[model samples]
Target: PTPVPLPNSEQFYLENDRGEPYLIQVSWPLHWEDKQTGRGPLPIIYIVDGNALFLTATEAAWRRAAASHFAGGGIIVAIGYPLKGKLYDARRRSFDLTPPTACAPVGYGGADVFLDFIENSVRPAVQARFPQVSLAREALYGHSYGGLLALHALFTRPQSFDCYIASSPSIWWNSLCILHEAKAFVETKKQSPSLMVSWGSWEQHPPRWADELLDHYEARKRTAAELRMADNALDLCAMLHGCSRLHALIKTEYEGEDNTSVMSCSVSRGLTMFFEDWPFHQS
Candidate 1:
């Protein structure tokens, strides 16, 4: 049987200064050139956890291609380790996605260096290859730890990307340390980039424990309470609302979804929000 080629897809391997090899996959919409006609340069979305989420994201664009095309199709840039047939290189992501702090666990705090690789190494390469992409209208999307990295990037350097989608971000890491960065970012008291954060309704606990043994259910409840996953995410949204520093901010909860299942909706909603127009409309 003949193989079907994926249209407008390209892949390349890149090694950063720290000698970490990354598998970078790029995709463009079917009518990318025409999409650029009235829209100016096409917008680009950088997706982390790309080893797992690249194809998911690419498919999402096409699934919503009608609305996307009506405005203009955008570019998708996925960053992952150089491993085929793997969802993640856990050891590497455990380091790359986390930020450094006194309370941070081992194999953490590599987020800054990782960003250097993306902005310094990967961004330039993407630019050279696709001059049709927009420099100022870039966005970033990530899930779980990758979601944490997305917010870290926005807080630490808002100038790099104009929009960010953080899906089920592990804000509980280091006792909710992400808020510390948010406070500092807020202190600057200037205009901020757009941010969309989504979480699962059951992020803190299972939707039900009807099948679980009585003892195990209680234990799970305790652990989930301590984690405070969705609670923290919700609080962060309200916190941002108080600051009034954002260009835009939205926090959506996906009912009937767990952390893992929530990602698909998060990606689709984010892609729609960012890629639909030049300024990212609220509608």
Candidate 2:
């Protein structure tokens, strides 16, 4: 297979007036100018954890642009931190991506302010640079704690995005407090954006080979069982399925995958489901 577009992208830092500095990565699809001029503006997919997923998302977005149905391509905005060498800033993300709960340690629960940073600061920046994007279609994607934030954003501000993707979300956080928000969202919101929930089978079920590290293995199994990763994701999906105003929804369980291995798969498939013009389930 041919290597896709050389990945035209820009990286920089945007410090929130009231918060820490965030590293923003914006990627353009191949021939974005021409596509915008020819077929109108492109859609957008805003990714949480930008440093970790920017390159992966660029590759995914560029590759998908070749498909006839999505030839117009879309824009990618990845929001992350300025960790000079690390792919993720664990400490900062714990603060940025989680909701308020008594169980959280110091620097936890900033998802709302963080989301506002995207809605207020980040989006305007991307739009100013590439004003040729459509406001009607937008997506938010997050994994792990970031996944939890995606759901919080959807429940709290359903009108902000056109779609949402929560991959391997830490639904057990704060004793699953987000479910209360879900109950409220379903009861109150009249119209809901599309949602795609996905997780790896191994996330909740460790392979026997993981027994190599008995200590780590037991911990993994314990966390998975106690927290019920896959179970929570499926249950949330089922609950949201009943919402009368939902535009669309889809959930996938990837085989032979775990937390770390499931991210790229989720982002790739999740973007397709967000931007696909026709039914992804058909083929």
Candidate 3:
């Protein structure tokens, strides 16, 4: 049996300044009062890697809302590359999600322009389409490299979103340039918004589960070194250390302010494995 498409969900394309097209998926809540001006406004959550996680997150949000009597009306917007299935445009993501670096690969350091499009183009279109979206309650959610982009927006353009959720962000990118930005942000800024940073407990370690997976499934395409390299590239240990320092820096800056908010969590399971096992469900 085929899975049905999400209710009130739509996908579209948006071209950047360079005429590069990006796939955007939008899922709206069952109720429209909040989004139609009858009630207040709907909180909007922007999900990166829409090609990968949009459906899962959308369904999760819908299920959670259904359990809660739809009290927290919300909208989910997923930004993805222009491809389908397990295919990803790696080069495109490399360019869009990373900051400027002396050693950056070709087409890197486009975060500023990508963000500009989000702020100027996407926001207006969304607001026009959904008149009752609560700008005050906007949140950005991303994982891995997407997580890096989320943190980038939070630190460099703090006013862009009210909440940021980064799951295992690639803080090792660009030689930890983001950490320096974070340090500067805390030192110069008086106030900060809410941010939730999470990492998998096994991210810093070798791929023990991968070994088991290979044995269990008799899969041999991926080598142990390849798996280990993925984990090492994330540099989870350094990310955790950087996150702790950022947490402390925020605390030091906002000790008496009483309006600072920051949260951190460590997931017991590897998110990479979780996604791999869960398998992508199509609409």
Candidate 4:
């Protein structure tokens, strides 16, 4: 029996910008449907966990494509493990999804190498195979450790992808090593990568337990305290003067920034600066 295409079943290998070889699994809608709709070249979305993201994103996009809602075709290329049967195998993901983390179990730090594969190997392969792919139309989506890598890639190599979608980042990786890396990257480098990060509403037992511990210690404990010792790990992770701060500072210096105008300026100026580490000079 012929298997039906389930969104990203059109799997292939591509060489990326970093000169490495890797697989890029993708899916496209029927050409008859696209021709009837008079669509143009399609945009491409890169899914970190294609086998998983397929259940969600591919279904949605496939339905939309079938309905002819998109002005052009849409392709979702899930860059995940190439395995036969069973989606529970997480070892490849564990290996390729994150940067070097002291907190990782062991043999980690393959993220940069994996990213190089994607940049140098996978991307070029895809372009060679699918010529309609526009560089500006590329997007990457990742989750958990993959989410952490997405942000890491955003901060360090923003030129690799145009947009990033991250979910439930393992921010605890190496006691927040990625966050530290993010700060360093921001302070020292620049690139304009659009991003969207979403966290699962569900909470794990450990985080829930930590929240209880914090409430108890916070009300009774008194003294100067750092966010690190606090119960919520997320608050500590976001401690930085990022896009919002730089924008506010600029407005304050220029227009006696009020609360309202400052917000507007923040969005406007922050967007202008969002794409680069140093918008004026690169060193």
The TM-score, computed over Cα atoms with residue i paired to residue i, of candidate 4 is 0.64
Q: Which stretches of candidate 1 lie over 4 Å from their true place?
A: 2-4, 32-40, 209-211, 242-244, 277-283
Per-prediction TM-score to the true structure, in the order listed: 0.90, 0.89, 0.71, 0.64
The local lDDT score (0 to 100) that residue 113 gets in candidate 2 is 85
Clashes of each: 0, 0, 0, 17
Q: Where does model 2 exceed 4 Å of error?
A: 1-7, 32-39, 189-191, 210-216, 278-283
Best by TM-score: 1
What lDDT is reached at residue 67 by model 2?
Answer: 81
In order, the Cα lDDT scores of the candidates are 0.82, 0.81, 0.58, 0.52
Clashing pairs in 3: none
- Model 3: per-residue Cα lDDT at residue 213: 64
Please tell me which model should have the higher lDDT, number 2 or number 3.
Answer: 2
- List CA RMSD, all candidates: 2.7, 3.6, 10.2, 10.6
Instruction: Give candidate 3 misplaced runs (Cα > 4 Å).
Output: 1-3, 31-39, 68-70, 189-191, 207-283
Ranking by TM-score: 1, 2, 3, 4
Candidate with better TM-score, 2 vs 3: 2
Could you give candidate 1's per-residue lDDT for residues 118-194 as a string of tens digits?
Answer: 99999998887766545547888989999999989988988878898899999998888889898888788664578
Clash pairs detected, candidate 2: none
Give the alpha carbon lDDT tens digit for every residue of 1-283 in model 2: 9776544677778988685899898877766554234235567889998888888888887788668767556778899988877789998889889987777778998888898889999999887776555554788999999899989988888888878889888999988999998988888837447777889999889786732878877887997899788899888888887686566777889999999999989998877666676233321
What value of lDDT does candidate 1 attain over all alpha carbons?
0.82
Question: What is the lDDT for 259 in model 4?
Answer: 19
Sort the predicted structures by lDDT, highest score first. 1, 2, 3, 4
